[PDB]
């Protein structure tokens, strides 16, 4: 879980309007621009999560 | 050089003709040695665990495949 100059990254996470932190390990190597997934926030759950920041 | 005689653990935890509980760990293995029979589940580490309560069935086919089962005691 160590960090430094290296490739990949640990990129933070958030939702449309919902407030939640996934914090998953991403990688800039093959492709990273869209960090977009589907994850479930505070109440409504059921949302698309843009982890791009 | 040399280093690390490793702890691991393994072995077969619940032996044959032994009465177990639901949730008890029957076999701790590495690959698939012992296949989960009727009444028996297999974890992601290929650990064999008990679904329900009952007695421990050991099944020997000539190995290569062999089976841990759970049959009811009652």
């Amino acid at each position: 879980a160590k960090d430094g100059p290296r490739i990949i990254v640990k990129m933070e996470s958030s939702a449309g309007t919902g407030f939640y932190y996934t914090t998953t390990k991403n990688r800039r190597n093959t492709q990273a621009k869209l960090e977009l997934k589907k994850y479930d926030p505070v109440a409504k759950k059921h949302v698309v999560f843009r982890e791009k920041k | 050089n040399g280093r690390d005689s490793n702890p691991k653990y393994l072995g077969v935890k619940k032996f044959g003709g032994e009465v177990v509980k639901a949730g008890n760990i029957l076999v701790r293995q590495r690959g698939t040695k012992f296949k989960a029979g009727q009444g028996v589940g297999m974890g992601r580490d290929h650990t064999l665990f008990a679904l329900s309560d009952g007695k421990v069935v050991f099944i020997n086919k000539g190995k290569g495949a062999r089976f841990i089962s759970i049959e009811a005691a009652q």
Partner: protein, 59 residues
């Protein structure tokens, strides 16, 4: 000792001790989701024996 009050040495009604799960608290996380909720309730009564003595009179 007098530091350990708000941190959990905490004593129950059966005269037992509250020490749960430390597995990762703040730094170094990013494994699973229920190791994170792995934070527990819990204890052992071996080192509970001399534990309370840190907290002794102030229950």
């Amino acid at each position: 000792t007098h530091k350990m009050a708000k941190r959990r040495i905490k004593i129950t009604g059966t005269g037992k001790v509250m020490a749960f799960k430390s597995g990762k608290r703040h730094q170094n996380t990013g494994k699973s989701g229920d190791e994170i909720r792995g934070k527990g309730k819990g204890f052992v009564l071996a080192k509970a024996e001399w534990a309370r003595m840190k907290l002794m009179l102030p229950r």
